[PDB]
Subunit: 255 residues, 4 copies
């Protein structure tokens, strides 16, 4: 549907028909992933807590989109969501661990409850999602995982320790998973965005200018920038790339 952004004019034949699963798929960056892969003729499942946003997006994208309600905190539901995707469409080809919560929080204010919940929301699911997709990928002898990283921990960004720490954790999990699963044909990399303009983000003008001034390239990045990178990392054109970060940040991380 021509009202939904295709994100790129590039055409990746290797993406047609591939089974893509994306967490936090109903808004922002995750929504853009969903749209971009749909536009490449992939069969795209997405998970999200927001049922009405989820169903509206699936309605807009049509029958090559599948919306599954899921609180990623709930690993049991997460593994059921995976099982359901497998039954419908077969083994996942591409997993994008995208779901995350970047609510700001001061070091001194974090309680044990808040820490644990933030870790469950930002880190734990990425591991279990990978664990769930892996055996089916291995049966086929191929598959691709993309962990959404962040330059925040790289730049040592203060004021959201749980989020930055989870993100840092994914940096390592990418490397060890790449080794653990590479022998099975599965490649795992991390897509690492800079400051991406989305609806959810936000004096807005002022903060946007500060990003431009800090960046090497003097324009704002958006969700399309992420999705273009994702398509490449999913396609057969990145077949030899594993264990690695790919940073799309207009230079924000190098200051």
């Amino acid at each position: 549907s021509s009202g939904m952004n295709r994100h790129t004019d590039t055409h990746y034949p290797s993406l047609a028909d591939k089974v893509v699963l994306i967490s936090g798929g109903a808004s922002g960056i995750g929504r853009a992933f969903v749209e971009a892969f749909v536009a490449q003729g992939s069969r795209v499942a997405f998970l999200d807590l927001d049922a009405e946003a989820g169903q509206g997006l699936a309605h807009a994208l049509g029958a090559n989109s599948l919306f599954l309600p899921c609180d990623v905190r709930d690993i049991e539901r997460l593994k059921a969501c995976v099982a359901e995707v497998e039954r419908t469409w077969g083994a996942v080809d591409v997993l994008i661990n995208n779901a995350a919560r970047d609510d700001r929080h001061a070091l001194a204010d974090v309680s044990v409850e808040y820490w644990d919940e933030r870790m469950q929301t930002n880190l734990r699911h990425a591991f279990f999602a990978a664990q769930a997709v892996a055996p089916g990928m291995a049966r086929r002898g191929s598959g691709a995982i993309i962990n959404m990283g962040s330059i925040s921990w790289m730049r040592g960004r203060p004021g959201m320790v749980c989020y930055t720490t989870a993100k840092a954790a994914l940096n390592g999990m990418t490397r060890t998973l790449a080794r653990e699963l590479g022998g099975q044909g599965i490649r795992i990399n991390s897509l690492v965005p800079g400051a991406i303009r989305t609806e959810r983000q936000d004096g807005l003008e002022a903060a946007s200018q500060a990003f431009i001034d800090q960046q090497m390239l003097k324009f704002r990045l958006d969700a399309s920038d992420c999705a273009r990178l994702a398509l490449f990392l999913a396609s057969d054109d990145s077949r030899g790339c594993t264990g690695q970060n790919f940073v799309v940040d207009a230079g924000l991380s190098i200051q």
Copy 2:
């Protein structure tokens, strides 16, 4: 006390009388830290699950050593241990988040409970220990934190996802905490060992695996606990006052292959 490993012949005057707190202090690398700082005239508190090992080591080291029993999974006890150190000796000067569990485990087999507990044992405590020491450090306007890292995740070592992932997490937490707390005078770095010969790590066979480390390393000798302790002393002293947010890798080149 006359039989104790001092770990180095170096003397750091800035370490005398400093309050040092170390988790997993009763054996292996943690024990070496405790000995080394004691030998520099620091006041060293240490936490460990093993009460008998803890009390024997504190008895051997004497009155500038303080052993507090603590399961680091238990945040409430962790915070009580800190508060007790503070009441005894004042604000902590040096925190070393050392406690960890590197038991091997297969990716495919990890359950939700195993994951959570491994994360609590390897990661969570390091944040809360930091949070507990911070206010007292800030009141003074100075302090140092050392997070024990690992080259395992850097080398993408398989077969212990929870441990390597926690270690990678500490890599990030170092950087953000360094920024968040630096305005208060607190510096935070990660000490990142390679393959350290210890009693646990030990437990040809052993000989063969030890040779493979030497063959893979750039320097052809086995690193031990003392190598870690010497690095820790430097990172605690006034000679590293300006260093923060950073890794310091003591690995004889194992991570560069």
Copy 3:
């Protein structure tokens, strides 16, 4: 032309008509770049020392290919090659600094002359080529530079100090040039291959060394020139418009061991 490796089935509309300049273009990885961009409807100029290889390849590819003979050590010729490309086709859109010499050499034996020439062959040209393309890019307000990096220095590979040192130098030059030129619309990244099977790299024995790469890699297959070209196309296209200052490693995991 009907017999030519296209390298990928992907189609990048943004690459059509773009002016692509590639050093060491006549063989191996450089030749693959030339073929791949030609297959996307780019206008591709390439530089190489080997005149007969160069002219045959341009003859095989046709009128959207332009071969300029060039010794990259000779900066004057390098700048003349650039100016000639500019006059033919306009401002370069994509520069790929690919020319290099990875001949093995012992640390202890390197002379002052060998060092200088190896640095001129492996490093110097990449800066001057960048400097030559920059003004034309800036006039348009857009452009992309790709510096061929190597995992060799990352893995601290011995036995070719000048090559690994040049490659490490490019790692830094990428970052500073990205900042220095980004205000003009120019993005700059490094494509960093692992162990690429080529005719030269080839020249059990071969079989045994090839197996050792597979055993050391995370993905159990040999990478080739096409793997590099596919990465290059992405880094040149509008799909990487926002990426700058960065490494992109295509190494099947060889650098993480």
Copy 4:
């Protein structure tokens, strides 16, 4: 002499009597190295182009200091300086490749001559100095090399391409030299300072404040900070450390 800074109160017994060689030793950071190691009872040789500054410093430090005039561009003189140190005191124990020129220069203005000279002044000597000291170290079965790095290339600092590029080059040379020479007992690491206040550096107040605001620790670093790190990297307390960077920058590189 109590007019010359000792830089630290720490005492490293393993440094007593060790033969230390430092390039660009007569001013700024290099001078501080010379003073600090002298104060630890090392036998310290230093190289510098400035003969009067060199001789004044050697005069202040006494007979455990040795000043050799040397233009590091001249590799022949560099290798003679090394040979002379070896003859006087024996094999070098510690080499600090410090000599460098950080004159600012725009990308478009660099000529071929300027590039080559900057590379000879900033990079080439570090390799040849290492090559010269190595065989003597290997005979003994021990030695330590410290390459002065810089966070400038890490932070992608514009406006001095030759300097930042040389510095980046040393980052790699450290790793490969560590492997090449490790089997001989020689360790090689890079000491990587942030923005160090020296006499040569420099509205000065304003620029100094901007460094404090950018840094995680809110004080200015000085030459002493570098020397304290150098002593550790030279001593037996870092015996197991090789191939690595050690960054002393108050957090400036993580922004």
